[PDB]
């Protein structure tokens, strides 16, 4: 009754690379140790998967298309690396994934943003991950403070990990050719995780990135920013609109941050802003 269950989870409804060097480059830049188990996202036919299996103790392949999983199965059947391949078919963003040291992914672009944070929030995350993204999304990750593409995504990812460009992949390298260019990046998650609350860092980052090129002081002038923040202070006292107005005024004045722009701010600047509100009792999230 295989059709009974697989049909209940799938309906049985992609741009395939044809440039051997990028696949060879991706595996080469992985620098896979012999005693490392690799999580491979988007095995496809298995051109990248087979190479990883040669140099890996184990390879866990996660696939979304039951078509493509079998072609992986057929390619590796009756081979010395058959025992070292485990294929998980279906959505993997909801499932709690196993332990892995390296992640090599021809990632689906739709789940690019969820994927980067799933690795970061993965307990004991992979030491290095070679992920292939589009230019627009990737350039935001690699964006440095003060640059045009500097954004909330850059600020959030940069403090939990370091992202570095590897190579550029042209749209001709795939067929049917996508309308957007492609790129390969290396993500190195920090160990130990910098001890800052995941919610608090997002909370400060978001309110100031509503208009990145606008002054931070203006970002707190919005009425709802005061209301959402005022109640947060009522929470601090439980365990006053004019007061929270005044408290914000002192923080931005003392830190000398009230007159600069979120698009031109570094990790330290936000951290100092994050502190000065904690001292005066204001917690974002």
């Amino acid at each position: 009754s295989a059709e009974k269950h697989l049909s209940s989870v799938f309906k049985f409804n992609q741009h395939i690379l044809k440039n051997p060097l990028v696949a060879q480059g991706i595996v080469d830049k992985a620098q896979i140790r012999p005693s490392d188990v690799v999580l491979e996202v988007g095995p496809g036919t298995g051109n990248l998967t087979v190479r990883i299996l040669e140099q890996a103790k184990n390879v866990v392949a996660v696939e979304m298309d039951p078509r493509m999983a079998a072609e992986l199965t057929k390619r590796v059947r009756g081979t010395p690396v058959e025992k070292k391949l485990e294929i998980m078919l279906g959505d993997f963003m909801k499932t709690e994934l196993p332990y892995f040291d390296i992640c090599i992914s021809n990632t689906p672009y739709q789940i690019s943003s969820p994927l980067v944070f799933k690795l970061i929030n993965q307990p004991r995350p992979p030491r290095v991950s070679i992920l292939m993204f589009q230019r627009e999304f990737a350039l935001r990750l690699l964006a440095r403070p003060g640059d045009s593409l500097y954004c909330r995504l850059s600020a959030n990812v940069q403090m939990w990990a370091n992202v570095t460009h590897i190579m550029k992949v042209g749209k001709n390298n795939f067929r049917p050719p996508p309308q957007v260019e492609s790129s390969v990046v290396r993500l190195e998650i920090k160990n130990p995780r910098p001890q800052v609350d995941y919610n608090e860092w997002d909370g400060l980052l978001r309110i100031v990135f509503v208009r990145k090129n606008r002054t931070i002081s203006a970002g707190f002038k919005s009425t709802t920013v005061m209301d959402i923040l005022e109640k947060n202070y009522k929470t601090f006292l439980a365990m006053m609109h004019d007061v929270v107005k005044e408290k914000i005024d002192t923080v931005l004045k003392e830190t000398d941050l009230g007159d600069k722009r979120a698009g031109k701010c570094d990790q330290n600047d936000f951290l100092r802003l994050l502190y000065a509100f904690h001292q005066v009792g204001i917690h974002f999230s």
Binding site: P194, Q195, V196, D197, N199, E200, D202, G203, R206, I207, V210, S222, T223, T224, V225, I228, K231, N232, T235, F236, Q267, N268, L271, R272, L274, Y275, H278, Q279, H283, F284, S285
Partner: peptide, 30 residues
């Protein structure tokens, strides 16, 4: 970095849960 180390180290002195704190996601509700 050494300046960063002081701040993050000092942050331990001021840390609190987030359970009841409403996130900034509510900002657009108005």
């Amino acid at each position: 970095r050494e300046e960063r180390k002081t701040i993050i180290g000092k942050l331990q002195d001021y840390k609190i849960d987030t359970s009841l704190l409403t996130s900034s996601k509510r900002l657009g509700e108005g």
